[PDB]
Amino acid sequence: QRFPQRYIELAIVVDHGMYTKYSSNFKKIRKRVHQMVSNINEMCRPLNIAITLALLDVWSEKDFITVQADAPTTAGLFGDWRERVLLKKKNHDHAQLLTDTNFARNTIGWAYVGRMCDEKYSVAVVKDHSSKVFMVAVTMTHELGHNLGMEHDDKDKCKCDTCIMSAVISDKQSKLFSDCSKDYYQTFLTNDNPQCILNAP
């Protein structure tokens, strides 16, 4: 394996709009979230990172934060709530909020760069923007990649055209991380090496 073993315990929060979208059916939502996690786990296999779903929270009554059009603003409110409320329910390493919100600027996902394990900044916000589970899962994986210190693929640095960290998603989206991405992850493990992902569940 090119990389040493790491583990990311995810918390996934499904907002009220997404709950409504899926006919307020908890079972159906849980199945969809598990299928997403199985895809994130598959995509991280070449990075030697075992991905688990530590916690699933479905906002079946109302939104606990204002899930608004600006994704970065929503991410900050989510990181705050994650630190103050979600982490108190069960420890986990990274949390993503899934929503049906039509984020501004045609945004389908957003996350802080290189802040994996941070109590407030180890988060991403992702729009459930396709009926295709894989398309949403690869968006979750792209944001996870940013949180692991990855920037977008650059043709001078690597040749992959449809890898996970491509600057823009496409219909032909690949499930692979480019060499640009693997090199950024190596840099992250060497310079940041956060302790929470060294810990197996």
| Both structure tokens of 177 | 């991380």
Helices 26-44 & 133-147 angle (0-180, nearest 10): 60
Give all strands (DSSP E) within 33-161, no chain letters.
Answer: 49-58, 94-99, 109-111, 123-127
| Both structure tokens of 19 | 């709950």
Q: Among residues 96, 16, 9, which one has the least CA distance to residue 44?
A: 9
Beta bridge partners of 74: none
Separation CA 101–CA 67 (nearest Å): 7
Residues annotated catalytic, as ranges: 143
Which residues, including other chains, have CB under 8 Å from residue 131's CB and lie 6 or more apart?
none
Say which residue the tokens 């792209």 belong to. 142
CA 67 to chain centre: 17
| Both structure tokens of 90 | 């069960």
| Both structure tokens of 38 | 């199985």
Q: Among residues 185, 192, 201, which one has the least CA distance to residue 4?
A: 185
74 is in an annotated binding site: no
How, if at all, do strands 49-58 and 123-127 pair?
Answer: unpaired
Q: Among residues 53, 52, 183, 197, which one has the least CA distance to residue 118?
A: 197
34 is in an annotated binding site: no
199 is in an annotated binding site: no
Radius of gyration of the chain (CA): 16
DSSP 8-state secondary structure symbol assigned to residue 65: S
- Is the Cβ–Cβ distance between 171 and 164 less than 8 Å? no
Provide φ and ψ at 75, rounded to 5°.
Answer: -60, -40
The HSE-up count of residue 141 (CA atoms within 13 Å, CB side) is 33
Determine whether domain 1-201 maps to CATH 3.40.50.720: no
